[PDB]
Design a binder for this molecule. Structure first.
Ligand SMILES: Cc1ncc(COP(=O)(O)O)c(C=O)c1O
Ligand SMILES: Cc1ncc(COP(=O)(O)O)c(C=O)c1O
Lengths: 371, 370
């Protein structure tokens, strides 16, 4: 697939915003605490490499990725810092981990026992492994205190290995009620407790934890959404410091026409003109990530809100303009214009999801520009 | 970034796309041509590999939405006619000319302006396809009086060619054919002022081709049907057996048994009602597998497995029946045993149409062909 360069639709990524967002968080964490920038899913749709480079200038000394291929892309970009693949890697790819000196998470001894084989008798390239203990997310990890204790000692029983860290992940750190959270921490504590040695990286925090549960054991935080300026808790809580939106979505009217009252517009004729109306055509559709369920949403033109009317097409949608306008004026889908602003949170709410998903859904067909 | 190292894949059955195009071509007046619309990267399946498959099947032309897309096709070796269905900014007229691409024209001014930039020259015309708006409400000339001036203008200057004219139906798949007839009537009008017609007079898409085969015109823009999807969703039965060409797969990468009353996934939305085996599948909403796919069930060893707990950005959890090890294949879309998952179903869950599900599957999921 290609990216719509010759089309007015565009995604603007304010890099400095990321940097600012990262710097400010670094300032609120102890001097013995590292900031790892998690840029998975192509930097949550903003672009990994750039998010990665912007995150570094802010104080980040490590990176968190979700796939082997994503960790490799960073290396290929010149990223020379620790990179942690947040999930289970296929044994068939162990050698790749050694080649790019990537850090992997381990969730079972089975993987480690098999990983040992296919691993040089004494390699000068030990495999950096972070053991994940699952005290509540229910996804992956050891359900120790005993299981981890066995995993760790096994990891140290072999020069082929090198355990960089041990971590857990909270499922409700963005929740008003903190009862469940406190339980996960208990399970993590119960469990470093059974050990006698600790790796260099003991991490448990994500954006939400870092913002609302600061006084929590650990020396390294995995900073995600917050660095792109998005409130990790939707609109349930206020960040500890003013985040700064890094994503803007722009397009332009490429056709403007007046329709008589009583005319149907779009598929299924879900909409019918109520009177003389000015309808403008915008070159962005669901195939670009501007989902169909966005119909009643309003975008910006010349500082005024305009209702998308009618079914959102695959490659475009229609907005009822306020007053007659030529084609060409810029249409702000996400971002500020005049006294009005469209937040990714707003789009998420219209879609009944979280901005996490909205940002990740924006197709690659939409060119991203960084400044 | 393509996740080639992740056990998650998208299987495109090109032979299927080919067969779908063929059967259409056979029930077609034959004299009438079939143009394969492959915008949005072949509706998520891959534009080039789809086009190529549709040509083997009988397609003698292509429909794209973006100038960029048309150039992908050309640079890929496609010498057949490529029609850009949207309006192309004037500043890119030279490129249309360069790659000899057909362009949609929905206004008079565009034509008058493009003329100046055109010639000055006497070599290759600008293949124009005029579009009248008789209902959709999107782009195009909205009266028969207009377009008349258009074709009149186009046929006057040797810079253009007027390769065709068309319109687009908005409800060609609704059981109620009311609004469909209206549009057909207006496009009828319309033609009923022109004393000549261009090489192509297209009007129908998947839906109308499948249910309104008797509508006038000599070429159809075959869209979703070639991909094996019911253009009406589940409202009408396809005029012929469509073979879906898309399949989505992955595999279990972590299996475990949880105690009763154990929470799973963000917000702790799911709680074990008793000891059970949970599975972890490497695919989440960042791949297009949306959060609202929560209650949905996938297939492993020919058995439904409910996706429990929240869907994460990169993966999700499923409840397994028997226990079992890591490695089994997970069919999110397709057949497995006697069970089957359709985009339709996936569409039903998300509460939208398969068109959308297809186009949302992230670039991060490797497409494999055969
Ligand atoms: C294990 C893990 N930690 C941290 C993050 C980041 O959390 P958040 O994006 O809320 O800050 C994610 C990223 O994909 C992750 O799954
Ligand atoms: C004008 C036109 N015809 C055909 C296709 C739609 O064909 P189908 O409805 O079969 O998907 C498209 C979409 O890109 C198009 O807009």
């Amino acid at each position: 697939m290609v990216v719509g360069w010759h089309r007015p639709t565009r995604l603007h990524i304010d890099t400095q915003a990321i940097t600012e967002n990262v710097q400010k968080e670094c300032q609120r964490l102890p001097e013995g605490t590292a900031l790892f920038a998690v840029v998975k899913a192509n930097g949550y749709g903003h672009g990994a490499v750039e998010s990665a480079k912007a995150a570094k200038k802010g104080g980040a000394t490590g990176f968190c990725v979700a796939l082997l291929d994503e960790a490799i892309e960073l290396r290929e970009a010149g990223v020379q810092d620790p990179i942690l693949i947040l999930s289970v890697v296929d044994l068939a790819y162990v050698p790749l981990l050694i080649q790019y000196d990537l850090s992997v998470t381990v969730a079972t001894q089975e993987w480690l026992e098999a990983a040992l084989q296919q691993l040089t008798p004494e390699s000068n390239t030990p495999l950096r492994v972070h053991l994940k203990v699952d005290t509540g997310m229910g996804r992956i990890g050891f359900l120790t205190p005993e299981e981890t204790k066995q995993a760790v000692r096994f990891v140290q029983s072999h020069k082929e290995f090198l355990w960089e860290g041990i971590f857990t992940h909270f499922s409700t750190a963005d929740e008003i009620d903190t009862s469940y959270f406190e339980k996960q921490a208990g399970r993590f504590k119960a469990v470093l407790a059974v050990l006698e040695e600790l790796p260099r990286y003991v991490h448990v925090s994500n954006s939400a934890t870092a913002l609302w549960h600061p006084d929590v054991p650990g020396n390294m935080i995995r900073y995600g959404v917050a660095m792109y300026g998005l409130n990790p808790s939707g609109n349930k809580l206020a960040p500890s410091y003013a985040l700064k939106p890094a994503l803007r979505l722009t397009s332009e009217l490429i056709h403007v026409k007046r329709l008589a009252a009583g005319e149907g517009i779009g598929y299924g004729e879900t909409y019918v003109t109520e009177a003389e109306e000015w309808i403008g055509t915008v070159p962005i559709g669901y195939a670009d990530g501007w989902l169909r369920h966005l119909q009643g949403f309003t975008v910006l033109v010349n500082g005024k809100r305009c209702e998308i009317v009618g079914r959102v097409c695959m490659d475009q949608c229609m907005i009822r303009l306020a007053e007659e306008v030529p084609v060409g004026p810029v249409v702000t889908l996400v971002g500020k214009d005049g006294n009005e602003e469209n937040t990714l949170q707003m789009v998420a709410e219209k879609l009944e999801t979280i901005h996490y998903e909205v940002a990740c859904t924006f197709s690659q067909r939409i060119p991203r520009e960084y400044n």
